[PDB]
Every structure is written in C-alpha cells, then in structure tokens.
Design a protein around this ligand. Structure first.
Ligand SMILES: C[C@@H](CN(C)C)S(=O)(=O)c1ccc(-c2cnc(N)c(C(=O)Nc3ccccc3)n2)cc1
Lengths: 1000, 257
C-alpha cells in the first residue's frame, strides 16, 4: 500500500546523526551496527562485514561483493537494494534493520519495477496479487499501446526521439488573429538569434527582420544570410546542422511550423517583447538523447445464449448485509434502495427492499424491475445503497444513505452478470444528500472492513452475452419543411444543460435521419433515444456508425457521466484522434484524465488514446503522470490509476528517471512541511527558519532538492537551490517560497531565479481548475481580438492536499500598496514614470476587464485587498480561488448572482488616469466596452465551459457535485435569455454592485 | 383559475422542481412558468422528470396541434382523469405537488424572528457537523496508516523468524562440532546471539500487538463518529430546508422588483 507517513522511519520524521541498525547475516547471526544516517549502503555493507569477523560462523560468509541488502519499507514491501549508492535515510525503512542476501532473479527487471513503484508511490507487486481477470487482462492488453509508441519514437531515430522529449510548443491555428498582426511592422517580426561561438563563451546578436510565416529552418537560413547569390547552396546544406531553442528554457523549434504559430513567438508579438532565440547544433542535442527501450514484463510472458433470446424481466436478489454503523435510539429501519441506470438516468423506477432492523440486515428478497432483459443497453448499471429510514416527527420520514456501491450489469467481456456476489460498500461522499450515487465508481470497496452486501443474480442455464454488432445492425433495418429545418438548428445550438421537452425529444427522434446534415446535434438527439428500448438503441448505433465527426470541444461532451454507451464514447474518441490538437489536449488534460473515472471498464478507447499521446508527447506525458499521481491516495481510483501509471512508466523511456527526481524532491518537502505542521507548530518564525535551513543544508537534502525539472513546467530546469531566498510565509497553512537558480546558459534573457510556493495542508484541485478555466477564457478573447491580459500562473496538485503554485514576481497586494484612495494610482505612477505610464494604465484596465468578467461568470470567492495584487508592470493578478459557483447557497439560502470583484474608487481612478468624474471618462467607456465584449465571447463559447465543468462532477470537488451546481454558470451567462437580454442582465449586475455608472 | 391552482408554482426553477419531485411515484406533477419570459408541465415517469410544454395560440391550449383546451386548468383536469396513455405512449396526472400543503406565520416581524432562530441553530449544527467530519476523515486516514504498519510488522516478523530458522539450520552442526572439540566458549557465543535475536523478535511482536490494540480502539471510535454523523446529516438537511422556506416567505411577503 502507499507509505503511511513522510518520515525516515515509522514514527520518526528524521533519523538522529547516528542510529543503531540490526544486521541479519546469512550465517544466522544478528549484528548491531552504529550507522551515520546518510551512510550509503556500500559503506554499511563494508563496515558490517568487517565487524562480522567478531561474531561466530564468519567462516560461512562469502565476499561482501556477493551480497546486497533487503528490508521492509514503509509501503510494507520487502525491497532489495541493488542501488548500493543509496543512503540509509533515503531507504523509506519501516524499522532500522537490514537483511543480508545474495541477489536472485532478474536484476534488470527487478530494478525497473522498483523505479516504477517509486514514481507510482506503490509497490508494483501489489498488482500481481490482484485476482481480478479484468485487472490482469488490462495489464497484458495495454502493452500493445506501449509497443506502438516506442516503435514510432525510433523511426528517424535522432529526430523522432527529440520530437518526443522536446515537442513543438505550437498553437492550433497558423492563422494569426488580426489584432496580433497589427503589432508586426509590414507583416514581419524582429527576432534576436543568439549564438555561443566556440572557442570562447561570448554571445553575439544577429538581429533579424524576417516574415512571421518563416519555418524555423527559413529563420536559420536568413540567420546565415546575414552573418555571411554565390553561397546559396552552402545555406541549402548547413541548415540541417543547427536547430532553434528559446533563450532561458528547454523549449525547441524542431518541426516545420510557421514561426508565429509557436507559443513563445506568438506571445512575444502580442506583449511587444523581443523573441530571443539560441542557435545550437542538432548533433549537440541528438547526442544528449538516450536510447530508451521497452521491455516486455514478467506478467506478459505468462499464461452461450444471446441477451435478445432471454424472454423475462430483470430481477436481482438482495440476500443480506454484514453490518451498518447506526444508533438504534435514532433510526427505525434499514433498507436497500436499488436502481438500474444508463449514466445518471434511471432506466426504470427505483426499487427498494422491505424495511428490516439494523440488528438483523437480511432480506433474501427478489427485486423486480420494469425492464425486459433484451431491452437492457450495454452500459446498464445497478446503483444501490443502504439507507436509514426514521419517521419520529410528522408524516414525513427522513431517509439517509449509510453506504453505496455500483455494479456493471455486463462484465468487461460483454457477459451479463450471473449468480451470487459479495460487494464491499463505500462511505457517502461528503455533501451528497441523494439516496443513490450513480456518478460513483463501479466495483467493491477494496477495504474489507466495510459493510458487505450479498447479491444474487439470475441464472439462465447458460452464459448470457450482449449481441454482436452484426445482430444489432440487422435489428435496426428490421425496426424501420423549412420551419422544421429552423427548429433543428435551434435545438443544436442550445447549451448542454438546457431543457428538452418530450415534444422536442419526439421531434428529434422522428427526424433522426435528417440530423446527419447538422452533426453538432448528436448529444440532444442521443438524449431523445429511449435506452430502455433495444429497437431505438439499435437504430441509434447504425446512425452513429456513419455519423460525421464533430469538433473536439463538442466531442468531449459525449465523454461525461451522461453518455455511458461504448459506441457513443467510441465516436467521441475518434473525433479527438482525428481533430484534437496536442495544444488542446494539453489544455483540457485535467478533464480528459478526470472522465477516465466515468468509464465502465479499465480497458477502453479513451485510456488507450490518452496513454498513446502521453507516450508520443513528453509534455502531455508529464502532466498525465502528475494528474494520475495526485489521486493515487483516493481508494476509489487508486487501482485504475495505478495500472495506467504502471503502463506509462514502463514505456515513458528516460523520463521515468526525471520523474523520480521530482517525486523524491517532493517527498523531502512533504517530510519538512510535516515536521513544522505537527512537532514544531507552536514555534516562532525565526526558530522555524533556523530548523528549515539546517535541514536543507544537509548533503542528502541538497542532492535531492537541487538539479531537477520543475513539475509546474518540465521545460523549466531547477538548478542550485538558493537557500538565502527561501522563505516560510506568515499566512494560511504557512507555504514554502522556494528559490532555484535557472541553470540555462542564456537564462538572463528569461529569468535567472525560478520561485515556486509549496503548499502542504490545503486542497488546490479547485484553485488549479479556476486557473485552467481562466487560461481557456483568455484564449477565447485573444483569438477573438481582445487583449484582456490576465496572469494565470501555474498551480499543480501533486497529492492529497499538497501542491505547487507559481510565484508571481514584482507583484504586491492592494493592502501592501496602501502603506488615501489615490495611493494606488500614485504607486503605479511612481513604479511606471514617464512615457511608459500609458502602457501600464492600458495593462491595468485590460487585466481589470478580464478578471471582472472571469470572476462574475465563475462566481469566484469574494475579493479584497489581500485577494487582489498588482505587478510593477501595471498588470492585475488575482490570487486564491478556494470557492466558485453558488458556494454560499447552502450556508445562506440567498438566490443571488453576485459581483465578486467590485471596482472601488481606487480602481476607477487608476483606469480614469486620475480624473475626478471616473464613470464619465472616455477611459471608463473603453473599459465597459471590453467587459461587454469579453462577456459575449465566453457566452458564445458557453457550451465549452459547461462541458468542462460537467466533465469534473466525479472529481470530489466540494463546489462541483451535481449538474445543479453548473446551473450557476447558466445564470451568469443568462443562456435561457437572448444575447441582448444577457448583456442587459450583465449591465444591471454591474450597476447594482457599483451603485450606478454602467451606461448603455 | 391557474393562480388559485395548487399544482401551479409560478416562477419556480427546474432545480427547485427536481427537489419537489425527487423519489416520488409516477403521476406526480406540477405546472410552472417556462424557463423563458407559455407554461411547462413536469411529470414523474420511470424515475425521471419529463418536461412537457403547454402550447398556447389565440387563447387555445394543448401539448400538440390541434389546441383543443380553453385554459391550462381544463388541460390539467382533463389528463387528471383521461390519462396521457393515448397521447404518445403513458400514465395520468395523479399526485399534484400542492403549494398550499406546506407551512404562513402571521406577521413579517414573526417570520423574521423565527428565521433568525432557525438560521442560528443552522450555523451551530453546520459547525458541529464539519467538526465531526474533520475527525471522521482524520480517524479514517489514521486507521489506514495503522493497517499498513501492521502489514509492515507482519513482514518484519516473517524476516526475523526466517533468521531463527537459518540459525537453527546452520548452528545444529557446529554445536555438535564444538562439543566434541571441547570448545564451550564458542557454543556460549552461538547461544548468546540466538537469545539476542529472539529477545528482539519478542519486542517486535509486542510492538505489533500494541499497534493492533490501538487499531481495535480506533476502529471503535471510527464506528461512533459514523453513528453520530448519520444522525446529524438528516436533521441538518431538514433544518436547512426549514430556514430556506422562511427566507423565501420573507421575500414573497415583502416588496419585490
Ligand atoms: C510584496 C508581498 C509582501 N512581502 C514584502 C513579503 S505581498 O504580501 O504583497 C505578496 C503576497 C503574495 C504574493 C503571491 C505571489 N504569487 C502567488 N502565486 C501568490 C498566491 O497565489 N498566494 C496564495 C495565497 C493564499 C491562497 C492561495 C494562493 N501570492 C505576492 C505578493
């Protein structure tokens, strides 16, 4: 299992300088050795075999060289230590002992499995022990993806390997937005090609004025053309001898994309910055690239009636439950509420058992469902729970769920479920009030110290299986105005959560064949199908088979908790395979990882699609690793995520070693923050920091916490940890501000110091999602011609209430600035003196409109002088987004869409360039216009935002548990209203908050 | 009239309707003002809430053309007896959600006073629940840790007991080989080391037995927190719904825009 604590031993956070270790010799003898906490095992073995002479039977011991150590780790694993260069404090030992053994078995394989299990934070050997055939089949069958990937990564071995490790950081459209174009002088950019020229280190600047459409090798060509018509062949050859890299980071321009299409260039054009590139040889890069190999694992090398034939209604028998944790002097009876679901929709009216006493949880009752067994669709599930009924006050009885669980009516091999079944039930997810949990994971609770429920599925004298696609295809053939053209277009454009009337369902279903013209209607039409009917589903399969592909932003909707059909989800995956860019995949990765939870089975086209891309692109692979790693503690997903991460780590190549470096740096930081939270909580900041540095100054600490890749950006290298600029903040959960040197050669042109906040104690998943949505909002604006510049700094959740936050350099909270209502305008006046004053004001106004629209729509936690900050730049930055949507509705039942960010007098003064009647200026008119645009832009892309939120319902986020939480976004964007009505709505909202000023 | 009509809920939300229709029998219905501005009939059937639009044209009402009915009431009442079985196959409009069945506390000051008391009791219980939840998750996490450490002790003990077997295996020959060679000192040395090993095994066995005991005690307190949690939860929902009703009445009785 995963390690209980962060300590160097069980119940010890850090080992004393010297420690006694029990050494179990192979001659049966026990040797107590005094070991220095940071002594490597090579030394320990050496000093132990020296001392072993003093003890009896030393004659039986072979050379020290013939052995290695084995011990019980914190994960309760018997780990063999082949990397003898490892120190004693880094072993993760449960107790201070070491057993001396001669190494047996496959050294190569054993070593990899240690490295995989460390990246996962769980011993791989635990998956070998899993009896479940699905679990085993999944491990074996997924290896084809692993093979497919490593094989593709070696065609054009020097280049293809580099396209994996350093992929192109490109936008999805080469076509420049018109507002970006006008920044270019006569449709061309000024780039600065820097070159380190051997024999001496020094620089040199080849300032180039080139077309923005220029492929990196055309930029490489014009770089030569300037530094030196007779030598046009000399450039036509030597252009494949040098590559382009971004100054200050490991970002590379390897593919033939137009220069402006690269994100570093595209940004530089917009922010009026000079793109500083570094020219380096292909040979000096392709040499650094190692030969990563995929080996097949130990486990890979080792060893009927149709559903449509069954003429009966579905029935399930509830035998008994083990126990429930309830007071009898409070509840009256206990019962099993059950339901047959297709996603989140009951296929039939829910069936309860009879009411029995908690002391006697035995029913032995057959539950009858109003569903004909042939009519059961592929994704049919059984959702059930044990509730507590008590009607002590009034006619109304109070039902409260005690434990839940869900089973797939069909196994991973289309087999209908039969015979007895034991199901360990899960705790009720906090905040869930509903008696059933259909968004819940399928399968038994792995912890067997939980209520078990005994179920009995019917037997049909044979193995029942779901029909083949040919049989279902056959059945579909057996089963078979201009005002109507307008109504169909109308439905297709409505948001994913708006009402469909039974009349609109019958309309859509009756016009199923015309739909194919407007493919964007597939989800509404899919909601018009009767899934409790084999006749309509059969016809639906043939239509989706030959359904035109839809945009990925639309396809993702078909991957949420509302569309469980494998043929539907299969269509969805194929749209993404064909049309989803690596940019958009990186953009919506949080959601794509998240929806793997809704999938019925471990092996599916989504898991395969994502894993393939993770092994094809190292940027995608890096966050795919972390997103899954950060949820390994959640027993509802640990096995699925463990198995997927296992297959990822076998095939990620060299990147496993880099990932391990980040993981080990993180665990030290988790240990350090854990000491200060418990053992030294009642301590002073001056004494807390003295402890902090003393521990960080240690050899083992420096070795682990220096020279690794930032987990916030794998292109960011974290060199030497500058201990002097490391600080424990005096705030909420006391985060760690950590400073690293940028080891990059031309680091001066980007940043020489990388600062990252390390939070241990608070859940950041929700903050992480708000910044992703904010990133997605800026793009919608940037591509639509709005320069509403926000600063969405990186936030990554790296575990159970543990994460990283990108530090925002040169920023100060409004409160800090107020150290008068003119203080703010004066601060920016002094910080941005002269000509540059106009650019700072334009930046503050643009960031204001962005954060105003963004906060209002999402319903972000109320703003204040600590929540808001300003950069020397003029740039406004919002920090802390622990709440969103109607988070205040449960505490205070006030039905109110609020304005979290109300521009105060200070704010309007800044925008108005110090004017008196602030709401009357031409500067404020320009501000309102920006907001009205921004708002309509997001309201245009509403479906995208609704789907992104919809894809997160199973995440466990406090403020996102039901579709009715997503209804908040539907109010702020006034989707039921018209474009003119919603804008008019937004205006009244801004007016009531600001107390007039918002003129039409 | 469709104002005096109990099933008619005016300006109610779909989210509100879902609560009003959650875990109800088929035939359960209620009419409301459409999610625009034209009315919507919501009906429970097969565990779902089916939204059926009420079309109006030139003072005539119905679900589909021809519009036969004269009023929304005449429309409801017809299907309250005739049944929807004929119009698209399926139940009737049997169990109405009455806007009159649930409790009008005389004066604005009276409601204001009671709401204040409810809202206060609510924040009290909310805090008590969140606190019990903090301990519920902390105990659950701590038990899980303990369970992994018993697994680690078990494996520790397995290694040490194998170590005894190794001593037993090897030493048996050498003790015989030393008794003959008259070397009693070395025999005493083999014995001292074995004694040393088993005394450690006894410490490791008691370290686990003490931990297994703390685990019995913590599994016990987990069971109580759960028992307590399952009792607060239903009261806290009711108490929150009562509060939310007094907040709505206050709004309904007062000056509205
Ligand atoms: C000038 C500073 C005072 N010195 C003189 C000591 S100050 O106080 O004006 C200041 C404080 C914080 C930040 C900062 C920078 N980057 C960030 N990502 C964050 C951030 O997200 N924090 C956060 C906090 C709570 C919850 C979630 C996130 N906070 C910047 C300035």
């Amino acid at each position: 299992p995963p390690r209980p604590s962060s300590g160097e031993l069980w119940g010890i956070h850090l080992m004393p300088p010297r420690i006694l270790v029990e050494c179990l010799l192979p001659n049966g003898m026990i040797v107590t050795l005094e070991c220095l906490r940071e002594a490597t095992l090579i030394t320990i073995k050496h000093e132990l075999f020296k001392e072993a002479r003093k003890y009896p039977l030393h004659q039986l011991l072979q050379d020290e060289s013939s052995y290695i150590f084995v011990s019980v780790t914190q994960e309760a694993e018997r780990e063999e230590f082949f990397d003898e260069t490892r120190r004693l404090c880094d072993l993760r030992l449960f107790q201070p002992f070491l057993k001396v053994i001669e190494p047996v078995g496959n050294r190569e394989e054993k070593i990899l499995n240690r490295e995989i299990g460390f990246a996962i934070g769980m011993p791989v050997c635990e998956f070998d022990m899993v009896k479940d055939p699905e679990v085993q089949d999944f491990r074996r069958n997924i290896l084809n993806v692993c093979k497919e990937a490593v094989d593709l990564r070696d065609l054009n071995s020097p280049h293809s390997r580099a396209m994996y490790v350093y992929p192109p950081n490109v936008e999805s459209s080469p076509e420049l937005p018109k507002h970006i174009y006008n920044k270019l002088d006569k449709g061309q950019i000024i780039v600065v090609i820097w070159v380190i020229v051997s024999p001496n280190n020094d620089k040199q600047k080849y300032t180039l004025k080139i077309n923005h459409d220029c492929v990196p090798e055309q930029v490489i060509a014009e770089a030569i053309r300037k530094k030196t018509e007779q030598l046009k062949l000399c450039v036509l050859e030597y252009q494949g001898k040098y590559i382009l890299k971004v100054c200050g980071c490991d970002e590379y321009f390897l593919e033939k994309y137009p220069l402006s299409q690269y994100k570093y260039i595209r940004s530089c054009i917009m922010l009026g910055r000079m793109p500083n590139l570094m020219l380096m040889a292909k040979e000096s890069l392709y040499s650094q690239l190692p030969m990563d190999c995929f080996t097949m694992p130990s486990y890979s090398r080792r060893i009927t009636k149709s559903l449509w034939v069954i003429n009966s209604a579905l029935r399930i028998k509830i035998l008994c439950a083990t126990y429930v944790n309830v007071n009898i002097r409070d509840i009256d009876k206990i019962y099993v509420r059950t339901g047959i679901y297709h996603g989140g929709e009951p296929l039939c009216d829910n069936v309860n058992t009879q009411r029995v006493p908690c002391s006697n949880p035995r029913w032995n009752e057959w539950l009858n469902y109003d569903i004909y067994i042939p009519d059961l669709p592929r994704a049919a599930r059984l959702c059930l729970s044990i509730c507590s009924v008590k009607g002590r006050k009034g006619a109304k009885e109070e039902h409260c769920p005690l434990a839940w669980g869900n089973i797939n009516l069909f196994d991973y091999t289309d087999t209908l479920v039969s015979g007895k079944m034991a199901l360990n039930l899960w705790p009720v997810p906090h905040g869930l009030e509903d008696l059933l949990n259909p968004i819940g994971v399928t399968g038994s609770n792995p912890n067997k110290e939980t209520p078990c429920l005994e179920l009995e599925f019917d037997w049909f004298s044979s193995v029942v299986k779901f029909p083949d696609m040919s049989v279902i295809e056959e059945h579909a053939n057996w089963s078979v105005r201009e005002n109507d053209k307008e109504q169909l277009k109308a439905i297709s454009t409505r948001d994913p959560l708006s009402e469909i009337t039974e009349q609109e369902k019958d309309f859509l279903w009756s016009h199923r064949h015309y739909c194919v013209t407007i493919p964007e209607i597939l989800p509404k039409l899919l909601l018009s199908v009767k899934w409790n009917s084999r006749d309509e589903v059969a016809q639906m399969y043939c239509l989706v088979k030959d359904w035109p592909p839809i945009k990925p932003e639309q396809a993702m909707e078909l991957l949420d908790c509302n569309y469980p059909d494998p043929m539907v989800r299969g269509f969805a995956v194929r749209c993404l395979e064909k049309y989803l860019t690596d940019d958009k995949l990186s953009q919506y990765l949080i959601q794509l990882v998240q929806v793997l939870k809704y999938e019925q089975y471990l092996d599916n086209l989504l898991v395969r699609f994502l894993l393939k891309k993770a092994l094809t692109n190292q940027r995608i692979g890096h966050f795919f690793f972390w997103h899954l790693k950060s949820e390994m503690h959640n027993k509802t997903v640990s096995q699925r995520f463990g198995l997927l991460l296992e297959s990822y780590c076998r095939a990620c190549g060299m990147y496993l070693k880099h990932l391990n470096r980040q993981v080990e740096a993180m665990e030290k930081l988790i240990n350090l923050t854990d000491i200060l939270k418990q053992e030294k909580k009642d301590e002073t900041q001056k004494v807390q920091m003295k402890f902090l540095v003393e521990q960080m100054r240690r050899p083992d600490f420096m070795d682990a916490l220096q020279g690794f890749l930032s987990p916030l950006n794998p292109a960011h290298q974290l060199g030497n940890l500058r201990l002097e600029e490391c600080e424990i903040m005096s705030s909420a959960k006391r985060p760690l501000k950590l400073n690293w040197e940028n080891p990059d050669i031309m680091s001066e042109l980007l940043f020489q110091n990388n600062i990252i906040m390390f939070k241990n104690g608070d859940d950041l998943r929700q903050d992480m999602l708000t910044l992703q949505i904010i990133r997605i909002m800026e793009n919608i604006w940037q591509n639509q011609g709005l320069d509403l510049r926000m600063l969405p700094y990186g936030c990554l959740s790296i575990g159970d209430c543990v994460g990283l936050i990108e530090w925002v350099r040169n920023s100060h909270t409004i409160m800090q600035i107020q150290c008068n209502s003119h203080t703010l305008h004066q601060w920016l006046k002094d910080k941005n003196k002269g000509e540059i004053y106009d650019a700072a004001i334009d930046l503050f106004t643009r960031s204001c409109a962005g954060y105003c629209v963004a906060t209002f729509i999402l319903g972000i936690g109320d703003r204040h002088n600590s929540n808001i900050m300003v950069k020397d730049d003029g740039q406004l930055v919002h920090i802390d987004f622990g709440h969103f949507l109607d988070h205040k509705k449960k505490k205070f039942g006030y039905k109110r869409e609020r304005v979290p960010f109300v521009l105060t007098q200070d704010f309007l003064i800044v925008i108005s360039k110090g004017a008196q009647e602030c709401t009357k200026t031409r500067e404020f008119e320009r501000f309102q216009e920006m907001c009205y645009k921004a708002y309509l832009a997001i309201r245009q892309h509403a479906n995208l935002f609704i789907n992104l939120f919809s894809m997160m319902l199973g995440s466990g986020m406090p403020e996102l548990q039901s579709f009715d939480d997503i209804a908040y976004i539907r109010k702020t964007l006034a989707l039921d209203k018209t474009e003119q009505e919603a804008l008019e709505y937004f205006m009244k909202q801004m007016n009531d908050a600001h107390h007039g000023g918002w003129t039409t | 009239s469709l104002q005096d009509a109990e099933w008619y809920w005016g300006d109610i939300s779909r989210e509100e309707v879902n609560e009003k229709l959650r875990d109800t029998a088929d035939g359960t219905f209620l009419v409301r003002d459409a999610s625009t501005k034209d009315y919507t009939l919501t009906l429970r059937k097969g565990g779902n809430n089916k939204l059926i639009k009420i079309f109006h044209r030139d003072g005539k009402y119905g679900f589909s053309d021809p519009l036969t009915f004269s009023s929304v009431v005449e429309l409801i009442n017809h299907y309250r007896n005739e049944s929807l079985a004929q119009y698209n196959p399926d139940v009737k409009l049997l169990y109405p959600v009455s806007k009159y069945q649930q409790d009008k506390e005389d004066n604005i000051e009276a409601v204001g006073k009671k709401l204040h008391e409810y809202n206060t009791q609510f924040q009290e219980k909310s805090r008590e629940y969140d606190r019990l939840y903090e301990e519920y998750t902390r105990t659950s996490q701590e038990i899980q840790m303990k369970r992994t450490a018993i697994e680690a002790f078990n494996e520790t003990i397995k290694i040490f007991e194998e170590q005894c077997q190794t001593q037993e295996r090897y030493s048996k020959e050498y003790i015989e080989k030393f008794k003959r060679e008259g070397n009693e000192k070395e025999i005493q040395r083999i014995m001292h080391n074995y004694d040393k090993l088993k005394s450690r095994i006894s410490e490791i066995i008691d370290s686990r037995r003490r931990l297994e005991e703390d685990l019995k005690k913590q599994a016990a307190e987990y069971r109580e927190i759960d028992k307590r949690m399952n009792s607060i939860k239903p009261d806290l929902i009711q108490l929150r719904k009562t509060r939310d009703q007094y907040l709505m009445w206050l709004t309904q009785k007062g000056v509205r825009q």
